[PDB]
Amino acid sequence: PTRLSLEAMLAERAMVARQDLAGLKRKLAGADRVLAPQSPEQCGRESAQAQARSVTSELKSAVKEAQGLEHQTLDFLEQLGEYPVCGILHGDHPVHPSGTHNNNGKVSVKRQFAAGVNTSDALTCAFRFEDSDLVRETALKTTYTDGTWAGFVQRLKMQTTRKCVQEKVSRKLLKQLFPYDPQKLVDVSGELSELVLGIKTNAIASAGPPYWRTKRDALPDMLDCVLPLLYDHIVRKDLTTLRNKHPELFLAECKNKTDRYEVESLGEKTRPYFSHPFHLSALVSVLSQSFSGALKIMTEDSTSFNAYGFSWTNGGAEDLAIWARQAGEAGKKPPRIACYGDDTDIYYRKDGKLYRICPDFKQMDGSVDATTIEAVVDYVVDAHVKQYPTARQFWEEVGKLWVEMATQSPFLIDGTKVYRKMQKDGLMTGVVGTTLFDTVKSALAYNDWADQLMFGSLNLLEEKYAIEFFKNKHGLVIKEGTWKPALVNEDPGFGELWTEQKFLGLQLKVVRRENEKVYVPNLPFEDWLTMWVTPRSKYRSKETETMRERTLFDRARGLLVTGAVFDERARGLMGAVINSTAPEVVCMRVQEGGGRGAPPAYAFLTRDGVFEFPISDGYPSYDWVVSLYSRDHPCDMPRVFPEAATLIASYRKQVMDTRVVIK
Amino acid sequence: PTRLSLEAMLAERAMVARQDLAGLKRKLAGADRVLAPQSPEQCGRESAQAQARSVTSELKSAVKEAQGLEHQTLDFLEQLGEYPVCGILHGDHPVHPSGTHNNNGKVSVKRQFAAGVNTSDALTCAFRFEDSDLVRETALKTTYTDGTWAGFVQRLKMQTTRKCVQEKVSRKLLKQLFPYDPQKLVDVSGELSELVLGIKTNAIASAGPPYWRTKRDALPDMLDCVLPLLYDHIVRKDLTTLRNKHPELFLAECKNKTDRYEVESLGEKTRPYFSHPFHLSALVSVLSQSFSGALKIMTEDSTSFNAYGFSWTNGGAEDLAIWARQAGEAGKKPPRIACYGDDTDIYYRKDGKLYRICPDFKQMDGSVDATTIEAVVDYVVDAHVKQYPTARQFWEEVGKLWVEMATQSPFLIDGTKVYRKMQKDGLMTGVVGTTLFDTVKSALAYNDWADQLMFGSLNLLEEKYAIEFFKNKHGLVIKEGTWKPALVNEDPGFGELWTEQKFLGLQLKVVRRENEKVYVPNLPFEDWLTMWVTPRSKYRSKETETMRERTLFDRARGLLVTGAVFDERARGLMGAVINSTAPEVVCMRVQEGGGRGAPPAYAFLTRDGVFEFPISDGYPSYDWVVSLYSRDHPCDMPRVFPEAATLIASYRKQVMDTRVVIKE
């Protein structure tokens, strides 16, 4: 015969074998397994499950009670009446699907505040392998929920009614604070379809009005129909006509963010965000994603305040330390200030000693003034049109759309009533460029702060005067008790911390590799525990037992990589989960991460955002994780089952020499 | 956000969309469709179905009657008693599966002679678009069937009891008739596992005893367990111990070949073939597939009698004609002789005129003498060990196994009785190297025939003396009426034939392409029709209407590429089928052919055997097929729906300039 080679035949066999769970279970039985250093079992199977259910039951009652609270009026917003449903057709169907988001010809939405909380699987594991009291107390503080109406409206009010301060800012200043590589900018003078096809986004996210579908679902309608229509009115300078005739094309949706929330403040705090039309966000994303890819970060340019793009792996963690040590005496030499969104890392020296500040902004978006927003858009647009002047006028028009989306977009909340922010001031969270808008506003305030240090106002190192400064001079609210300068351990020993403070949600720590120091992320056990027992996903009954077991395995690998392996208790807990995962679940074919397993949830491991596990049946050992954060003495990801490949293929090669003598 | 690009998002939609038939049907509803040349409809669906069921009913009845006939005794074979079931274990399971092929501890088989007949879907199409009488009488002539017990035993007896003539053959003569490229030989001095993993075979073919499973199912058992055991006994020269302990490791199975058979002779003709153990055939395949890849063909070396490797596309068809014209005057200069297994093409000149002979051997495997078989194995082994002398002893041992497999393997037929061919003479059809063994035996015969012409015996050009010659001097049986010399049209005009004879099942034709001649394969309409209405697949229970419609589409393309496009009537029928195929079926994602659609059944289009369509939603037009058989002037395969991609994606790119001036 001659159809396919035996080698190819073996390969095909291997591929279908990893989809046969019963086959994997049989063949991997009694196989040599790499076991993690796990914590001892603390209670039986049934006990752990019952304790987890008790917590879940209590959290569900707290959510239900808080969701029962009445919410304030929305009178703090301007009301615009009702919008007609978009009647634009694309071939054989309307872009606005019939029988959805339609109340008698008017666009409508309904906010969902479900009673269901996060799954109990991870919490069960916590009770199984850790202290009952600590697990219970930790789990009862936080829950993954839709939030509440009362907390939603309260938080919405806070960021749409705050008195802002217009920043004193120019292009020249932004060039100093946010340098970039012009050669990294996308050629926006190219054809628009190709540019739009280049932007990246969440395929599962809402495409907003008028699509009312996921982005991947609405993608042809956006590209083939609405976008050319939008383009035609832009270049003819006829947007008002399009706005007036098809208002849903410029309509946003104000949604409640499903998230981890503090139980005690459920009725006062639920974060709003705005979902804009797909065509608008995608068009603007050309500039926004181009610019963010060209931005220098602080560790590359000491004049930069920008942390937007910083990542921990590949020496990133140590780069932070090296950069921070360059901080000078307050009032004599420049400090070291890092801005990523509303998160800030400040370093200064006092009498030669390095101090670190990590303060929190309170609802920063409500403090972002219209001047800053316009200045950022102008800066981003100018950066491109200086590089590619032949396309200036088109992208300056897009810039105007951008500013409107960030400040004055009409939006739905619940029902048919259309609202609008009373003032331009205040950033509409969720708009494209949100992180940059926040980063610049923060950097501008901290730049002024640093200038006042050089002016001689050294009492701005103190919380009371610092908080007053940011409020009065920049309209920013620093949470009381979060401005606490800490003495930095500039050259930490093995197992020692940088400080106890967090930047981008993580502590900085030094661990041992051979005789060299490696800077790695770190958290207290209870912080790892909180993340672990509150996964960001609801109860789905379609999820089979196998999928749920695999999820625990993937999330455990995720936390370890993020730095849980560097905390002994967290290491032992994640180790228990891994060791408890069945062989067939470890070695089965998975879809997530391109067949390599779901990537960690933490978003700042790499700059491009995407972290890839080498293999889906891989074990995140201490040595391997350390290798991820060092500039490299590289390491393979060890397999949980070293003999998995041969056992699954039911064949291990043995050398058979043809050159042997016989007679 | 940021997860994947809109471009990648679009491509991901495109993949999903071609798997959604309901969506395809909708989005391709009013699409511009390019139609192939077609014959008009001759009757309605219900009429075609009724006529199709009528024919099928008669064929089933004829098969049942023929299968009812009693068969001869099998005492013409040696009886070896019964073999014990192999008890070799591979980990947690036996290599010979429990509860299968086991009659009280003894190996057993059961021949399958079912009354099942090929599907009637293709036959229905024929009634729809062609002449009722012609379609009916053509369909009644042949049928795809398991054969009969009577014909099976009769044919087995004929190829195991024929008196053969031992050929006079040396390495020197074989080097003359079958030259090869030594540099193209596989390095058989390398490690054995890598070599064996390199051979190619049919994944769903039987792995034979003791596996009693498909090759892909039994592959780990063979590789990890049996093969190292076989290797160990070979290198220790201890095969006898292995044979005596585990006889099933060397047992073959004699099977009835399911095939297209003439209804007239169902009770007298069912072809037997042998299925050898996978470890033995795979090991031998290392030498055999290496050698066939290194062999020269007639059109590369004018001294070669070898056709084994010839293919029609990319100028191959014209290469045949060019090679054939070199034939000289009979008795003065050498003729042109080409051997492909049991198929031969012979050219000679008389009074300057070019003549062609295409005779048929009657069951050639029965005539393949043991001397020829041993000589071929020796030639193949020597070829490798002369190029790679460090592995000489191992492959010489394999050569001995090869000879045994081809002549003397014990085998089952039906039940537990083990049989063996009485004489060494006679090739056990199905053994690795079958084609080569046949090719050489024929070439040796025709080489001797050619020599006698040079010695002045010109009466051997006549059938009477030719048949006598091949019988008495080489033990070969030329079928009467098949030795018929025909005048060759040496330079055929447009639409004319080389001759009306066939080589490798096809005629040779000249067709027009841009006022230039292209040599192409051809068949008369009835031959294309016969193949069309008799597909090589029984009615299986699981196949949906969609899969059945796609199969019609694929088979129609297959025949067109094979040459049906060059016969107007056959083209019209294939085009009618293609054009009546639903849009969603044409454009849907398919698994066969690497996603390009199932390749043609005809095996000699390319030398590597692998033919692949450019696209799964294209159709074989005249211009494209001609481009395949020409050396150059290639062509794009035309799409049935030119706008399919944009329609399915629901997106057509339009240029939006960012460099426009908006104000002043």
Short mmCIF file of N, CA and C in Angstrom, two decimals, chain A residues 1-7 9-10 13 26 90 92 188-193 196-203 215-217 219-220 222-224 227-228 231 234-235 237 278 289 390-391 393-395 397 400 649-663, chain B residues 1-7 9-10 12-13 26 90 92 188-193 196-203 215-217 219-220 222-224 227-228 231 234-235 237 278 289 390-391 393-395 397 649-663:
data_model
loop_
_atom_site.label_atom_id
_atom_site.label_comp_id
_atom_site.label_asym_id
_atom_site.label_seq_id
_atom_site.Cartn_x
_atom_site.Cartn_y
_atom_site.Cartn_z
N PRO A 1 0.82 -1.21 0.00
CA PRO A 1 0.00 0.00 0.00
C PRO A 1 0.85 1.26 0.00
N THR A 2 0.20 2.42 -0.04
CA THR A 2 0.88 3.71 0.08
C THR A 2 -0.15 4.81 0.27
N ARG A 3 -0.52 5.07 1.52
CA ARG A 3 -1.45 6.15 1.84
C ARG A 3 -0.79 7.20 2.72
N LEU A 4 -0.27 6.77 3.87
CA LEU A 4 0.49 7.64 4.74
C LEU A 4 1.58 6.85 5.46
N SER A 5 2.63 7.56 5.88
CA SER A 5 3.76 6.93 6.55
C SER A 5 3.36 6.43 7.93
N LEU A 6 4.11 5.46 8.46
CA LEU A 6 3.83 4.93 9.79
C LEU A 6 4.09 6.00 10.85
N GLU A 7 5.03 6.90 10.57
CA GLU A 7 5.31 8.00 11.47
C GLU A 7 4.12 8.94 11.56
N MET A 9 1.13 8.08 10.85
CA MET A 9 0.09 7.24 11.45
C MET A 9 0.17 7.30 12.97
N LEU A 10 1.39 7.25 13.49
CA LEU A 10 1.63 7.36 14.93
C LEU A 10 1.21 8.72 15.46
N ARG A 13 -2.52 8.92 15.68
CA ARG A 13 -2.90 8.11 16.84
C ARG A 13 -2.76 8.89 18.14
N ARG A 26 -6.61 4.82 31.74
CA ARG A 26 -6.05 3.47 31.77
C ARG A 26 -4.54 3.48 31.55
N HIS A 90 -28.32 45.42 6.37
CA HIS A 90 -27.14 44.86 5.72
C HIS A 90 -27.51 43.57 5.01
N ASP A 92 -29.76 40.89 3.98
CA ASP A 92 -31.06 40.29 4.31
C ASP A 92 -31.44 40.44 5.78
N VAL A 188 -0.77 55.47 9.49
CA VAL A 188 -2.20 55.75 9.40
C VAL A 188 -2.57 56.43 8.08
N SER A 189 -1.57 56.65 7.23
CA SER A 189 -1.81 57.21 5.90
C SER A 189 -2.18 56.09 4.93
N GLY A 190 -2.09 54.85 5.41
CA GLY A 190 -2.51 53.70 4.63
C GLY A 190 -4.02 53.61 4.54
N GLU A 191 -4.50 52.64 3.78
CA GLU A 191 -5.93 52.44 3.57
C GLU A 191 -6.60 52.02 4.89
N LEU A 192 -7.82 52.51 5.11
CA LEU A 192 -8.46 52.40 6.42
C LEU A 192 -8.89 50.98 6.78
N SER A 193 -9.41 50.23 5.81
CA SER A 193 -9.86 48.86 6.07
C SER A 193 -8.72 48.01 6.64
N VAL A 196 -8.00 49.15 10.29
CA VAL A 196 -9.02 48.69 11.23
C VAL A 196 -8.89 47.18 11.48
N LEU A 197 -8.59 46.43 10.42
CA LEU A 197 -8.39 44.98 10.56
C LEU A 197 -7.20 44.65 11.45
N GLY A 198 -6.33 45.63 11.67
CA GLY A 198 -5.13 45.42 12.46
C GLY A 198 -5.33 45.55 13.96
N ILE A 199 -6.40 46.22 14.38
CA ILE A 199 -6.62 46.42 15.80
C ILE A 199 -7.07 45.12 16.47
N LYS A 200 -6.75 44.98 17.75
CA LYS A 200 -7.11 43.79 18.50
C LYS A 200 -8.19 44.10 19.52
N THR A 201 -9.06 43.14 19.77
CA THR A 201 -10.13 43.33 20.74
C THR A 201 -10.69 41.99 21.22
N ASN A 202 -11.60 42.05 22.19
CA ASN A 202 -12.22 40.85 22.73
C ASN A 202 -13.38 40.40 21.85
N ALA A 203 -13.23 39.22 21.26
CA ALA A 203 -14.22 38.69 20.33
C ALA A 203 -15.56 38.40 21.00
N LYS A 215 -18.82 41.04 19.45
CA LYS A 215 -18.04 41.69 18.40
C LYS A 215 -17.79 40.76 17.22
N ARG A 216 -17.48 39.50 17.50
CA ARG A 216 -17.22 38.55 16.42
C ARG A 216 -18.51 38.24 15.66
N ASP A 217 -19.65 38.38 16.33
CA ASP A 217 -20.94 38.18 15.68
C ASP A 217 -21.29 39.37 14.79
N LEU A 219 -19.17 41.62 13.57
CA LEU A 219 -18.02 42.08 12.80
C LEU A 219 -18.30 42.37 11.32
N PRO A 220 -19.00 41.47 10.60
CA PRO A 220 -19.26 41.81 9.20
C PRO A 220 -20.18 43.01 9.02
N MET A 222 -20.41 45.54 10.98
CA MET A 222 -19.62 46.73 11.29
C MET A 222 -18.72 47.10 10.11
N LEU A 223 -17.96 46.12 9.63
CA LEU A 223 -16.97 46.35 8.58
C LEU A 223 -17.58 46.66 7.22
N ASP A 224 -18.57 45.86 6.83
CA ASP A 224 -19.09 45.91 5.47
C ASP A 224 -20.18 46.96 5.30
N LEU A 227 -19.26 50.92 8.99
CA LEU A 227 -17.99 51.63 8.87
C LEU A 227 -17.84 52.43 7.57
N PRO A 228 -18.21 51.85 6.41
CA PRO A 228 -18.13 52.69 5.20
C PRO A 228 -19.09 53.87 5.26
N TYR A 231 -17.40 56.41 7.48
CA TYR A 231 -16.31 57.01 6.72
C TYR A 231 -16.82 58.07 5.75
N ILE A 234 -17.76 61.23 7.51
CA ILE A 234 -16.57 61.90 8.04
C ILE A 234 -15.91 62.75 6.96
N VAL A 235 -15.62 62.13 5.81
CA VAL A 235 -14.88 62.81 4.75
C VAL A 235 -15.71 63.88 4.04
N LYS A 237 -17.67 65.72 5.87
CA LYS A 237 -17.93 66.59 7.01
C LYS A 237 -19.44 66.70 7.26
N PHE A 278 -19.30 49.50 18.23
CA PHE A 278 -18.14 48.80 17.70
C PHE A 278 -17.37 49.64 16.68
N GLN A 289 -4.13 51.93 20.00
CA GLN A 289 -3.28 50.74 20.09
C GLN A 289 -1.94 50.97 19.40
N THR A 390 0.20 63.26 5.42
CA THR A 390 -0.75 63.17 4.31
C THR A 390 -2.15 62.74 4.77
N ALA A 391 -2.25 62.25 6.00
CA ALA A 391 -3.54 61.80 6.53
C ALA A 391 -3.99 62.60 7.75
N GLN A 393 -5.98 65.44 8.22
CA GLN A 393 -7.35 65.91 8.37
C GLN A 393 -8.32 64.79 8.76
N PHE A 394 -8.13 63.60 8.21
CA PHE A 394 -9.02 62.48 8.54
C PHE A 394 -8.92 62.10 10.02
N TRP A 395 -7.70 62.00 10.53
CA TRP A 395 -7.50 61.51 11.89
C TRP A 395 -7.74 62.59 12.94
N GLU A 397 -10.35 64.42 12.58
CA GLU A 397 -11.79 64.22 12.69
C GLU A 397 -12.10 63.05 13.62
N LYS A 400 -11.84 64.08 17.19
CA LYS A 400 -13.02 64.76 17.72
C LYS A 400 -14.07 63.75 18.18
N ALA A 649 1.16 7.06 23.54
CA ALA A 649 1.39 6.52 22.21
C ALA A 649 1.53 5.00 22.24
N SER A 650 1.64 4.44 23.44
CA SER A 650 1.81 3.00 23.65
C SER A 650 3.05 2.48 22.92
N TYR A 651 4.06 3.33 22.81
CA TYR A 651 5.28 2.98 22.08
C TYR A 651 6.47 3.81 22.53
N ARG A 652 7.55 3.13 22.92
CA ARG A 652 8.80 3.81 23.22
C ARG A 652 9.91 3.24 22.34
N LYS A 653 10.57 4.11 21.59
CA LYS A 653 11.60 3.71 20.65
C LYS A 653 12.78 3.02 21.31
N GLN A 654 13.19 1.88 20.75
CA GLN A 654 14.44 1.25 21.13
C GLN A 654 15.31 1.04 19.90
N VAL A 655 16.59 1.39 20.01
CA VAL A 655 17.51 1.33 18.89
C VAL A 655 17.69 -0.10 18.38
N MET A 656 17.42 -0.30 17.10
CA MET A 656 17.67 -1.58 16.45
C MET A 656 18.67 -1.40 15.30
N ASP A 657 19.90 -1.85 15.53
CA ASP A 657 20.99 -1.63 14.60
C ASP A 657 20.97 -2.61 13.43
N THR A 658 21.04 -2.07 12.22
CA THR A 658 21.03 -2.89 11.01
C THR A 658 22.44 -3.33 10.61
N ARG A 659 23.44 -2.76 11.27
CA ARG A 659 24.83 -3.02 10.91
C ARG A 659 25.43 -4.18 11.70
N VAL A 660 24.62 -4.79 12.56
CA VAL A 660 25.06 -5.90 13.40
C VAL A 660 25.53 -7.09 12.55
N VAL A 661 26.58 -7.76 13.00
CA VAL A 661 27.04 -8.98 12.33
C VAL A 661 26.22 -10.16 12.84
N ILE A 662 26.05 -11.17 11.98
CA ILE A 662 25.20 -12.30 12.31
C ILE A 662 25.97 -13.62 12.24
N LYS A 663 26.75 -13.78 11.17
CA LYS A 663 27.54 -14.99 10.99
C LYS A 663 28.99 -14.65 10.66
N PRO B 1 -10.47 46.50 23.94
CA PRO B 1 -9.76 45.37 24.55
C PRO B 1 -8.54 44.96 23.74
N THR B 2 -8.07 43.73 23.93
CA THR B 2 -6.96 43.18 23.15
C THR B 2 -6.83 41.67 23.39
N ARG B 3 -7.21 40.88 22.39
CA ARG B 3 -7.09 39.43 22.47
C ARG B 3 -6.69 38.84 21.12
N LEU B 4 -7.41 39.22 20.07
CA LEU B 4 -7.00 38.87 18.71
C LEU B 4 -7.48 39.93 17.71
N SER B 5 -6.79 40.02 16.58
CA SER B 5 -7.07 41.05 15.59
C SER B 5 -8.39 40.79 14.87
N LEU B 6 -8.98 41.85 14.34
CA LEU B 6 -10.22 41.73 13.57
C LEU B 6 -9.99 40.87 12.33
N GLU B 7 -8.78 40.94 11.78
CA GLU B 7 -8.41 40.10 10.65
C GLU B 7 -8.49 38.62 11.02
N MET B 9 -10.09 37.46 13.52
CA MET B 9 -11.49 37.24 13.89
C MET B 9 -12.32 36.88 12.66
N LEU B 10 -12.05 37.57 11.55
CA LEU B 10 -12.75 37.31 10.29
C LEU B 10 -12.44 35.91 9.76
N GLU B 12 -11.48 33.38 11.48
CA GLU B 12 -12.07 32.41 12.39
C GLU B 12 -13.55 32.22 12.08
N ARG B 13 -14.22 33.31 11.70
CA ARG B 13 -15.61 33.24 11.25
C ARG B 13 -15.72 32.43 9.96
N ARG B 26 -28.15 29.58 2.72
CA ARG B 26 -28.77 30.90 2.76
C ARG B 26 -27.92 31.94 2.03
N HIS B 90 1.24 -7.44 25.16
CA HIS B 90 1.84 -6.12 25.10
C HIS B 90 1.25 -5.25 26.20
N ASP B 92 -0.94 -4.52 29.02
CA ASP B 92 -2.15 -5.01 29.68
C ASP B 92 -3.13 -5.71 28.73
N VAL B 188 19.73 2.05 4.17
CA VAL B 188 19.22 0.96 4.99
C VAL B 188 20.24 0.51 6.04
N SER B 189 21.35 1.24 6.14
CA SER B 189 22.33 0.99 7.18
C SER B 189 22.02 1.82 8.42
N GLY B 190 21.00 2.66 8.32
CA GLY B 190 20.54 3.45 9.45
C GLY B 190 19.79 2.60 10.45
N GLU B 191 19.38 3.20 11.56
CA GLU B 191 18.66 2.49 12.61
C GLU B 191 17.29 2.03 12.10
N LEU B 192 16.91 0.80 12.46
CA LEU B 192 15.76 0.14 11.86
C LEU B 192 14.42 0.83 12.13
N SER B 193 14.23 1.33 13.35
CA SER B 193 12.97 1.96 13.73
C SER B 193 12.64 3.14 12.83
N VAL B 196 11.62 1.84 9.31
CA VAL B 196 10.28 1.26 9.28
C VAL B 196 9.21 2.34 9.40
N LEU B 197 9.50 3.36 10.21
CA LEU B 197 8.57 4.47 10.39
C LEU B 197 8.42 5.29 9.11
N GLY B 198 9.33 5.08 8.16
CA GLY B 198 9.33 5.82 6.92
C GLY B 198 8.49 5.21 5.81
N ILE B 199 8.17 3.92 5.94
CA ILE B 199 7.37 3.26 4.91
C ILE B 199 5.93 3.75 4.96
N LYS B 200 5.24 3.68 3.83
CA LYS B 200 3.86 4.13 3.75
C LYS B 200 2.92 2.96 3.50
N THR B 201 1.73 3.03 4.08
CA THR B 201 0.76 1.95 3.94
C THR B 201 -0.67 2.44 4.21
N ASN B 202 -1.64 1.56 3.98
CA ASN B 202 -3.05 1.89 4.18
C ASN B 202 -3.46 1.70 5.64
N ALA B 203 -3.86 2.79 6.28
CA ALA B 203 -4.14 2.79 7.72
C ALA B 203 -5.30 1.88 8.11
N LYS B 215 -4.28 -1.51 10.50
CA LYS B 215 -2.86 -1.21 10.69
C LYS B 215 -2.66 -0.07 11.68
N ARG B 216 -3.52 0.94 11.63
CA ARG B 216 -3.37 2.08 12.54
C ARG B 216 -3.74 1.68 13.96
N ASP B 217 -4.66 0.73 14.10
CA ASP B 217 -5.04 0.24 15.42
C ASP B 217 -3.95 -0.66 16.02
N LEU B 219 -0.73 -0.67 15.14
CA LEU B 219 0.59 -0.09 14.92
C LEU B 219 1.48 -0.09 16.19
N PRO B 220 0.95 0.34 17.35
CA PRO B 220 1.81 0.30 18.55
C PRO B 220 2.20 -1.12 18.95
N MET B 222 2.64 -3.60 16.95
CA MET B 222 3.66 -4.05 16.01
C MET B 222 5.01 -3.42 16.31
N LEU B 223 5.02 -2.10 16.45
CA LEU B 223 6.25 -1.34 16.69
C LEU B 223 6.95 -1.63 18.02
N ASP B 224 6.16 -1.67 19.09
CA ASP B 224 6.73 -1.69 20.43
C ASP B 224 6.93 -3.10 20.96
N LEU B 227 7.86 -6.26 16.52
CA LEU B 227 9.02 -5.93 15.70
C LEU B 227 10.37 -6.10 16.43
N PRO B 228 10.48 -5.62 17.69
CA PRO B 228 11.76 -5.89 18.38
C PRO B 228 12.00 -7.37 18.62
N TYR B 231 13.18 -8.73 15.28
CA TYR B 231 14.55 -8.25 15.10
C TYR B 231 15.54 -9.08 15.91
N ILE B 234 16.10 -12.47 14.36
CA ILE B 234 16.80 -12.35 13.09
C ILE B 234 18.30 -12.21 13.31
N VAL B 235 18.69 -11.29 14.19
CA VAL B 235 20.10 -11.00 14.42
C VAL B 235 20.80 -12.12 15.18
N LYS B 237 19.94 -15.16 14.53
CA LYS B 237 19.68 -16.26 13.60
C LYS B 237 18.87 -17.35 14.30
N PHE B 278 1.66 -7.70 9.73
CA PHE B 278 2.10 -6.32 9.54
C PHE B 278 3.61 -6.15 9.78
N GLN B 289 9.88 -0.28 -1.12
CA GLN B 289 9.48 1.10 -1.40
C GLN B 289 10.70 1.97 -1.70
N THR B 390 27.53 -1.92 5.13
CA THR B 390 27.64 -2.18 6.57
C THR B 390 26.43 -2.95 7.10
N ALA B 391 25.32 -2.91 6.36
CA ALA B 391 24.10 -3.59 6.79
C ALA B 391 23.77 -4.78 5.89
N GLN B 393 24.41 -8.18 6.05
CA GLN B 393 23.92 -9.44 6.61
C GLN B 393 22.47 -9.37 7.09
N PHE B 394 22.08 -8.24 7.67
CA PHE B 394 20.71 -8.10 8.18
C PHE B 394 19.69 -8.16 7.05
N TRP B 395 19.94 -7.40 5.99
CA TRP B 395 18.97 -7.29 4.91
C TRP B 395 18.95 -8.52 4.01
N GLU B 397 19.06 -11.45 5.38
CA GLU B 397 18.13 -12.25 6.17
C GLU B 397 16.69 -11.84 5.88
N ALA B 649 -18.27 35.17 3.95
CA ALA B 649 -17.73 36.06 4.97
C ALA B 649 -18.65 37.25 5.24
N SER B 650 -19.62 37.46 4.35
CA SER B 650 -20.55 38.58 4.42
C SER B 650 -19.80 39.92 4.47
N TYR B 651 -18.69 39.99 3.75
CA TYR B 651 -17.87 41.19 3.74
C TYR B 651 -17.10 41.34 2.43
N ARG B 652 -17.27 42.48 1.78
CA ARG B 652 -16.51 42.81 0.59
C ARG B 652 -15.69 44.07 0.83
N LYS B 653 -14.37 43.94 0.72
CA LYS B 653 -13.45 45.04 0.96
C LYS B 653 -13.68 46.20 -0.01
N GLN B 654 -13.79 47.41 0.53
CA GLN B 654 -13.83 48.60 -0.32
C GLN B 654 -12.84 49.64 0.21
N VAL B 655 -12.17 50.31 -0.72
CA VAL B 655 -11.07 51.20 -0.39
C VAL B 655 -11.54 52.49 0.27
N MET B 656 -11.03 52.75 1.47
CA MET B 656 -11.32 53.98 2.17
C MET B 656 -10.03 54.75 2.42
N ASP B 657 -9.86 55.84 1.67
CA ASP B 657 -8.62 56.61 1.68
C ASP B 657 -8.53 57.53 2.90
N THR B 658 -7.42 57.44 3.62
CA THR B 658 -7.20 58.29 4.78
C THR B 658 -6.49 59.59 4.40
N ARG B 659 -6.07 59.69 3.15
CA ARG B 659 -5.29 60.83 2.69
C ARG B 659 -6.17 61.91 2.06
N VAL B 660 -7.48 61.78 2.23
CA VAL B 660 -8.42 62.72 1.64
C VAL B 660 -8.36 64.09 2.31
N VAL B 661 -8.68 65.13 1.55
CA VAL B 661 -8.81 66.47 2.09
C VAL B 661 -10.27 66.72 2.43
N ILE B 662 -10.53 67.09 3.68
CA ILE B 662 -11.89 67.26 4.15
C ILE B 662 -12.31 68.72 4.12
N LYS B 663 -11.40 69.61 4.49
CA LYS B 663 -11.68 71.04 4.52
C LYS B 663 -10.75 71.83 3.60
#
